[PDB]
Amino acid sequence: AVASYDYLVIGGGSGGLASARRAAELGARAAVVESHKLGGTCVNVGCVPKKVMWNTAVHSEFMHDHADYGFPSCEGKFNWRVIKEKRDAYVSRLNAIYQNNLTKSHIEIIRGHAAFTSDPKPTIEVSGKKYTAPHILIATGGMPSTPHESQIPGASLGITSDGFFQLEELPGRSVIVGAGYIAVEMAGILSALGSKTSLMIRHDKVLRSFDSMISTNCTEELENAGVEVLKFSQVKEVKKTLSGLEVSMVTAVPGRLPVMTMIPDVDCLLWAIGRVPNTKDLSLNKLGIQTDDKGHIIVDEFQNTNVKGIYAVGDVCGKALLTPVAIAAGRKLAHRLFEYKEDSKLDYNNIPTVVFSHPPIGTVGLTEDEAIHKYGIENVKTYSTSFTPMYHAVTKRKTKCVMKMVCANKEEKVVGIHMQGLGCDEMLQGFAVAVKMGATKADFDNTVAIHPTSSEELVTLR
Amino acid sequence: AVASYDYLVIGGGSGGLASARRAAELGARAAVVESHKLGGTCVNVGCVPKKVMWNTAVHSEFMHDHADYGFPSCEGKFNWRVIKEKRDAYVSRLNAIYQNNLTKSHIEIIRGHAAFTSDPKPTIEVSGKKYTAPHILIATGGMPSTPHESQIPGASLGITSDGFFQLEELPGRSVIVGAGYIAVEMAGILSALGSKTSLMIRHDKVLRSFDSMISTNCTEELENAGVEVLKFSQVKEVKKTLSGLEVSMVTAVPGRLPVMTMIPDVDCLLWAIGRVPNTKDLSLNKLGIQTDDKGHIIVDEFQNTNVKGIYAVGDVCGKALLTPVAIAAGRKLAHRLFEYKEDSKLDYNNIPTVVFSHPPIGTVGLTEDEAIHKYGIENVKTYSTSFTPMYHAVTKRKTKCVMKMVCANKEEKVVGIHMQGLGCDEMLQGFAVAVKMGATKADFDNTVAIHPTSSEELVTLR
Numbered sequence A, B: 001a002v003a004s005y006d007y008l009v010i011g012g013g014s015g016g017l018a019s020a021r022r023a024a025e026l027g028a029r030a031a032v033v034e035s036h037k038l039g040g041t042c043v044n045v046g047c048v049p050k051k052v053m054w055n056t057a058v059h060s061e062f063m064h065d066h067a068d069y070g071f072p073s074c075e076g077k078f079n080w081r082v083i084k085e086k087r088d089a090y091v092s093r094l095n096a097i098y099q100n101n102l103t104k105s106h107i108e109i110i111r112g113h114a115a116f117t118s119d120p121k122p123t124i125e126v127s128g129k130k131y132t133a134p135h136i137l138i139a140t141g142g143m144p145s146t147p148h149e150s151q152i153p154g155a156s157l158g159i160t161s162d163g164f165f166q167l168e169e170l171p172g173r174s175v176i177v178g179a180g181y182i183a184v185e186m187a188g189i190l191s192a193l194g195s196k197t198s199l200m201i202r203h204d205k206v207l208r209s210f211d212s213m214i215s216t217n218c219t220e221e222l223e224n225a226g227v228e229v230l231k232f233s234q235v236k237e238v239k240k241t242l243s244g245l246e247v248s249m250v251t252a253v254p255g256r257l258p259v260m261t262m263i264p265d266v267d268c269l270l271w272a273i274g275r276v277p278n279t280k281d282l283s284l285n286k287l288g289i290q291t292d293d294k295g296h297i298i299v300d301e302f303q304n305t306n307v308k309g310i311y312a313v314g315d316v317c318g319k320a321l322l323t324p325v326a327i328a329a330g331r332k333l334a335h336r337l338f339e340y341k342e343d344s345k346l347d348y349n350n351i352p353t354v355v356f357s358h359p360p361i362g363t364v365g366l367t368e369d370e371a372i373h374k375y376g377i378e379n380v381k382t383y384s385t386s387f388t389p390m391y392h393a394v395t396k397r398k399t400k401c402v403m404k405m406v407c408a409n410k411e412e413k414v415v416g417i418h419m420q421g422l423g424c425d426e427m428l429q430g431f432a433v434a435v436k437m438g439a440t441k442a443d444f445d446n447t448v449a450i451h452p453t454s455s456e457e458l459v460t461l462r
């Protein structure tokens, strides 16, 4: 027996929920399949609990300035368990809201793990029951990548971001492996909260896919914050000891000889080396659904798979792994399918992003090097500044603000904006609207500044 | 004997310095006359020292959340003198930088008070020496308004924002009079830092020229922060007592009878009731230079006075009293005069502004009521939201975030943006660029969100 819907969504995370809710608004008879907790990575083990911990870190860092601002010092210890409990309660409140959003939209929730069947007409099975629809969205997300034991014996002794959100105490000594978003954000949080923290990176800098200015500056800010950045370093082996884990490292700096070092007494080894898509047990082969070598579902610009009536959005596709991207792609797809808007699709250019470092990073558009490759060196002009925000005019501790504008062609179209500094997390969104509209440098300089702010520096570059 | 220049600038504040520096870049032989401290109101008694005190307040308010975020409480007293000294040192550093900027630009500094002479060819006198130029800019700013003794006996016992920056101790008990920027900002700072603070306003709400949503919300946030808002209340008399000042108030709420109340034991009475232009001793009559009844210099859209070769910018003109406005008008004027750009002028529409309340306010463009008057009620559509930022998901203390988008005509051109909330001070600038470019609601909704932030709510209104 097979129940029919207009729309079946596999995965109740950001993308799947957003697409189902918009489809239902257009009248679709929809159901969402979820094997674990509604809200997916974002709510449970991602964006939201991360941000709570970032706010906790941020608070702690500012408090090192309390005496400089005229107050008696604040010298006691952080209590991880306090905030863990409150963070968990917030996640539970969101789980309840997301469930209610589906109920209010009359979207059926199917609890369990979906897999495709080999019915020529696309059908899924969940707990022995079959479901079909003319439109099936795969929105199953990803999971942390960990090294294989055959490569790094002992790797299973480390944790990932999933395990980070299960920690019940502050680790005394932390080693974070990797050089992208999670490594940067988690190292900064753990070090701000009092862990003796090292960040082990394969090259000389973090965030190497970002503009060079950001990669340089972020690495410097980590070091100045007390994170020990172990450059040109990789883990060879991990062993359990009486005193935590011992991490065997190889360091191979260009121009020097390679060197092996043991790092003893590690309480927390965190692998932050990318994500892999959650597709292994979907039975994609039963329908011939195309994947790459890593298991990502292949899609066109409209989120179609190679199989009619099957679509995919979000992290499972491997492109632009951000909550708002999953949401926007999922909504655009709902309008295409259920409002018949044949040209509705997400533009993957000019997507803004923030890294919750200390201070935070904002970027949208092309790096300077990407613009030079695209437009030619003679047709790219960059404008930049660096300054110490006036917040620190009265403090002994310092952070910098760096900003870069990348402009193309004679009209100086703004094709990239890159910044790190206090406030940059909230500053970027509006600049992203201007960039999406094709703003030129003249449009920025025609906008009157707001004083005194950091944001005004972006409209007064020369 | 009369020394000749291309450009004479009266006043070394925001507008005067900016215009002189841009003129010098274009080759002008320029001089700036300054009777007091370079940097004017902004550096000395305005923007900069205010912002240092705002940061001190902001810090204090966040620290009431320290135990909620997992730290042992921080229970000692603020020491005003600590921060006053550091604030004064920062002002001194800026005075030195501004002086050096003029030296580096080869702009002569004339120390003293300028007044016009009655030479038909426009000439000024400073300390008995005469100076002339074909172009003279009046950039003399304003000063705080205080009541006349004939209206409010004892008014001279109060201070203004100038005197606020001379305070050497935290006043125990503060009464702030007025209902605009300074009253809101100063009440919030004094109350956050521990003064028992009342705000005495003539009507029911503060910021009545702002969008109604902002006026309402700001008033509510002041009250929820512990500021006592004395509505429909005005000062009749002030007397010196053994215990501070006694303030005699009349309260006249619509629908009730008027009532007289004495407020005893006031340490600080602050008048925040507007500014008046600094023109009384300029000898404007010697050249027939036109003023209004309040003493503002009258100008056209190009900052011309009614007298050829004489111009005015900034607070002395009474329009859009903000540092960036003075600067932008002064730069545009320099390009008109010294680069011969006959159409160079400042557009006074779509100037953004922030009020440094708790939380801060940002606005650009038309209020909902202004848009209805301009476009017709049937041609205005507003979008709004209200939420509690996730910063407070773990705190007992709360603040709200409110946002309003005002759209006009079938294309839903964004003609106003109004917000109050954590981060709004740094969020506004980029949205102001989009508004200046004529963004529509579709341009906002075509921009992918940044998560988790408050700023994303402005691109996801429905």
Ligand SMILES: Cc1cc2nc3c(=O)[nH]c(=O)nc-3n(C[C@H](O)[C@H](O)[C@H](O)COP(=O)(O)OP(=O)(O)OC[C@H]3O[C@@H](n4cnc5c(N)ncnc54)[C@H](O)[C@@H]3O)c2cc1C
Binding pocket: A010, A011, A012, A013, A014, A015, A016, A033, A034, A035, A036, A037, A038, A039, A040, A041, A042, A045, A046, A047, A048, A050, A112, A113, A114, A115, A139, A140, A141, A142, A161, A182, A278, A281, A282, A313, A314, A315, A316, A321, A322, A323, A324, A326, B450, B451, B452
């Ligand atoms: C630590 C961390 C921090 C991050 N911080 C941010 C941030 O600040 N901002 C940002 O924009 N992005 C951030 N991201 C990225 C963001 O969380 C992801 O891009 C987004 O969650 C992906 O959404 P999705 O819908 O593709 O997948 P997911 O939210 O991962 O949802 C997939 C859902 O499918 C379910 N599922 C899987 N297979 C099946 C099956 N066969 N049957 C039924 N259910 C199934 C899963 O249980 C899950 O709930 C962060 C990620 C991590 C890991």
Ligand SMILES: Cc1cc2nc3c(=O)[nH]c(=O)nc-3n(C[C@H](O)[C@H](O)[C@H](O)COP(=O)(O)OP(=O)(O)OC[C@H]3O[C@@H](n4cnc5c(N)ncnc54)[C@H](O)[C@@H]3O)c2cc1C
Binding pocket: A450, A451, A452, B010, B011, B012, B013, B014, B015, B016, B033, B034, B035, B036, B037, B038, B039, B040, B041, B042, B045, B046, B047, B048, B050, B112, B113, B114, B115, B139, B140, B141, B142, B161, B182, B278, B281, B282, B313, B314, B315, B316, B321, B322, B323, B324, B326
């Ligand atoms: C408490 C307070 C807080 C503020 N906060 C902000 C804020 O956060 N953001 C913002 O954008 N705006 C703010 N403002 C407004 C801003 O400071 C003013 O808009 C700006 O300073 C005006 O610049 P100006 O060049 O017109 O005048 P001023 O900076 O006032 O400069 C005029 C100069 O002329 C000199 N002078 C006057 N007459 C003569 C004469 N005859 N001969 C020689 N010299 C003379 C004066 O000594 C002075 O230095 C604030 C103002 C106040 C009072």
Ligand SMILES: NC(=O)C1=CN([C@@H]2O[C@H](COP(=O)(O)OP(=O)(O)OC[C@H]3O[C@@H](n4cnc5c(N)ncnc54)[C@H](OP(=O)(O)O)[C@@H]3O)[C@@H](O)[C@H]2O)C=CC1
Binding pocket: A177, A178, A179, A180, A181, A182, A183, A185, A201, A202, A203, A205, A206, A207, A208, A272, A273, A274, A275, A320, A321, A322, A353, A354, A355, A356
């Ligand atoms: N604020 C936000 O928006 C957040 C978003 N996310 C999203 O989730 C994605 C996944 O995050 P994350 O796991 O950090 O992945 P990322 O891909 O961002 O970064 C991992 C980096 O680690 C390095 N690396 C890769 N393999 C290894 C290896 N075997 N050993 C050591 N280092 C290695 C690489 O940098 P190198 O080549 O320099 O060594 C690589 O770029 C992010 O890219 C982002 O899209 C995650 C967190 C926050």
Ligand SMILES: NC(=O)C1=CN([C@@H]2O[C@H](COP(=O)(O)OP(=O)(O)OC[C@H]3O[C@@H](n4cnc5c(N)ncnc54)[C@H](OP(=O)(O)O)[C@@H]3O)[C@@H](O)[C@H]2O)C=CC1
Binding pocket: B177, B178, B179, B180, B181, B182, B183, B185, B201, B202, B203, B205, B206, B207, B208, B272, B273, B274, B275, B320, B321, B322, B353, B354, B355, B356
């Ligand atoms: N963050 C920034 O950008 C800042 C900018 N500034 C600039 O400086 C200007 C001057 O600030 P401020 O002095 O606050 O002036 P404002 O004009 O902003 O506000 C004064 C308000 O006080 C009320 N008022 C006026 N006369 C009296 C009276 N006799 N008794 C009681 N209340 C009275 C009025 O409101 P009502 O009619 O409701 O009684 C009036 O609107 C600002 O307008 C702004 O342009 C100042 C500070 C910060």
